Amino acid sequence: GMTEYKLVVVGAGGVGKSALTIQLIQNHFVDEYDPTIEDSYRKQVVIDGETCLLDILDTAGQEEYSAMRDQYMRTGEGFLCVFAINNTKSFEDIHHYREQIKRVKDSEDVPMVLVGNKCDLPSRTVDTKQAQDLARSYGIPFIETSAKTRQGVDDAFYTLVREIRKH
Numbered sequence: 001g002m003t004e005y006k007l008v009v010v011g012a013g014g015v016g017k018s019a020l021t022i023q024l025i026q027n028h029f030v031d032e033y034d035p036t037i038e039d040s041y042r043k044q045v046v047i048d049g050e051t052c053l054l055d056i057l058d059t060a061g062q063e064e065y066s067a068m069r070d071q072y073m074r075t076g077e078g079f080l081c082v083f084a085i086n087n088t089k090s091f092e093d094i095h096h097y098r099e100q101i102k103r104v105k106d107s108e109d110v111p112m113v114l115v116g117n118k119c120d121l122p123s124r125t126v127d128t129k130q131a132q133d134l135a136r137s138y139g140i141p142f143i144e145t146s147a148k149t150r151q152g153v154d155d156a157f158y159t160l161v162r163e164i165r166k167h
C-alpha cells in the first residue's frame with residue numbers, strides 16, 4: 001500500500017524553502033524562484049524500504065492567519081523548520097514557526113526537523129552547536145543542508161518522515 005506523508009516546509013523568507021523543495025522534486029538548484037509563490041508537490045519515493053508518497057507544501061505568500069490558511073497548515077503531518085546558517089534572524093524566527101505549528105496542531109509534540117540550510121556558504125553566523133542545542137531542547141533532529149550542492153536534502157525530508165512515523 002502507499003502511505004502518504006504530508007510535509008510542510010516553513011522558515012523565514014530567503015532561507016531556501018523553495019530551493020530545498022525543488023532540489024528534492026526536480027534534482028536541480030534553482031537560484032531564483034519567485035519568493036511569493038506557494039505550491040505543493042507530490043513525489044513517490046522509497047524510504048527505509050517503504051514506498052510512500054510525499055505531499056509537500058512549500059510555504060510562501062504572505063503572513064496571515066485566516067481560517068483557510070490555518071486549515072491548510074493543519075493538514076501538515078510534519079514540518080521542516082528551515083533557517084539559513086548565514087542569517088541569525090532566520091534562526092531566531094524558528095521560535096515563531098514552532099509556535100504557529102503547535103497552535104494549529106493543538107499539540108506540544110508535532111513531528112518536526114530543524115534544518116540549517118546554505119551549509120555550502122563560508123560566512124556562517126549560526127554555529128552548529130547552537131543549532132544542535134536548540135533542536136535538543138525541542139526534542140527534534142537537526143540537519144544541515146545545502147540546496148545548492150544537494151547535501152542533506154533527501155535526508156532532511158526522509159528524517160522528517162521517520163519523525164512522523166514516531167508519532
Ligand SMILES: C=C(F)C(=O)N1CCN(c2nc(OC[C@@H]3CCCN3C)nc3c2CCN(c2cccc4cccc(Cl)c24)C3)C[C@@H]1CC#N
Pocket residue numbers: 009010011012013014035036059060061062063064065069070073074093096097100101104
Ligand atoms: C518570501 C517570504 F517572505 C516567505 O517565504 N514568507 C514570509 C511570510 N510568511 C509567513 N511569515 C510569518 O512570520 C514572519 C515573521 C516572523 C515573526 C513574525 N513575522 C513578523 N509567519 C507565517 C507565515 C506564513 C503563514 N503562517 C502560518 C499561518 C497560520 C498557521 C501556520 C501554522 C504553522 C506554520 C505557519 Cl508558517 C503558519 C505563519 C510566509 C513565508 C515564511 C514562511 N513559512
Ligand SMILES: Nc1nc2c(ncn2[C@@H]2O[C@H](COP(=O)(O)OP(=O)(O)O)[C@@H](O)[C@H]2O)c(=O)[nH]1
Pocket residue numbers: 011012013014015016017018019020030031032033034035117118119120121145146147148149
Ligand atoms: N549558497 C546557497 N544559496 C541558497 C541555498 N538555498 C537557497 N539559496 C539561495 O537563497 C535564495 C532564497 O532561496 P529560496 O528557495 O527562494 O528561499 P525561500 O524564500 O525560503 O523559498 C535564493 O537566491 C537561492 O539561490 C543553499 O543551500 N546555498
Ligand SMILES: [Zn+2]
Pocket residue numbers: 017018019033034035036037059060
Ligand atoms: Zn520560496
Ligand SMILES: [Zn+2]
Pocket residue numbers: 004006055
Ligand atoms: Zn495528499
Ligand SMILES: [Zn+2]
Pocket residue numbers: 095096097099100
Ligand atoms: Zn509568533
